[PDB]
């Protein structure tokens, strides 16, 4: 039959805490920053 676990928003915030992740967070940020660099160079602001 059914199965469920529910947490309220407040409950989840109360469980919020360097925190380890399982992906390369440095590379992920670097990719996004490189995109912003290229968008800035290519958009004509003036």
């Amino acid at each position: 039959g059914p199965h469920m676990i529910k947490y309220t928003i407040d409950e989840l915030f109360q469980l919020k805490p360097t925190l380890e992740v399982n992906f390369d967070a440095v590379e992920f940020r670097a990719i996004i920053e490189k995109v912003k660099q290229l968008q800035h160079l290519k958009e004509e602001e003036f």
């Binding site: 676990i5 947490y7 928003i9 925190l19 992920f28 940020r29 996004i32």
Partner: protein, 173 residues
């Protein structure tokens, strides 16, 4: 100490194309998966906030057995246009994610998408539901999560409208 979530979820990122040719590649990539509250917060702490993302970025947070994609699939999306709430995008996004992974928005909810676009950012809550009765309850709860007291920011688009160039919502709240 672990607080398990009802299901596992995957965060996906859609990277903006910087060259025309990149539109021929798969720019939608899975970032990481999580299945506890602690794992969720570790991810949030280690990824850029919505307001920092380049134009044409998307974040997708979907149940593990759901890729973020037919027109003839069942259900649709509740689309939230930030408009005048745009300064609060990071907190509204986080609250939406908590409502989803904590299963309090839901009766089902497949995933949620953040879209960064010129002129205006939006979120989309993807549901398999069709009947207006559950969709109105979902949309009303979503509206409460977002602390919206005016009408017009929420539009429900059935999956069928995806085929269109000018899709039209069947519910607006």
């Amino acid at each position: 100490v672990k607080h398990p979530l009802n299901t596992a979820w995957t965060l996906w990122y859609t990277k903006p194309a910087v060259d025309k040719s990149e539109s021929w590649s798969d720019l939608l990539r899975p970032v990481t998966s999580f299945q506890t509250v602690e794992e969720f917060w570790a991810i949030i702490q280690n990824i850029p906030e919505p307001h920092e993302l380049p134009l044409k970025s998307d974040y997708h947070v979907f149940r593990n057995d759901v890729r973020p994609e037919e027109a003839n699939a069942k259900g649709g999306k509740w689309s939230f246009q930030l408009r005048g709430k745009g300064a609060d995008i990071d907190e509204l996004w986080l609250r939406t994610l908590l409502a989803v992974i904590g299963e309090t928005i839901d009766e089902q909810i497949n995933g949620v998408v953040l879209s960064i676009r010129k002129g205006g950012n939006k979120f989309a809550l993807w549901t398999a539901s069709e009947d207006k009765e559950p969709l109105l309850r979902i949309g009303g709860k979503f509206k409460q999560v977002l602390a919206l007291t005016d009408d017009g920011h929420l539009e429900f688009f059935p999956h069928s409208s995806a085929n269109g160039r000018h899709p039209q919502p069947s519910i607006t709240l």
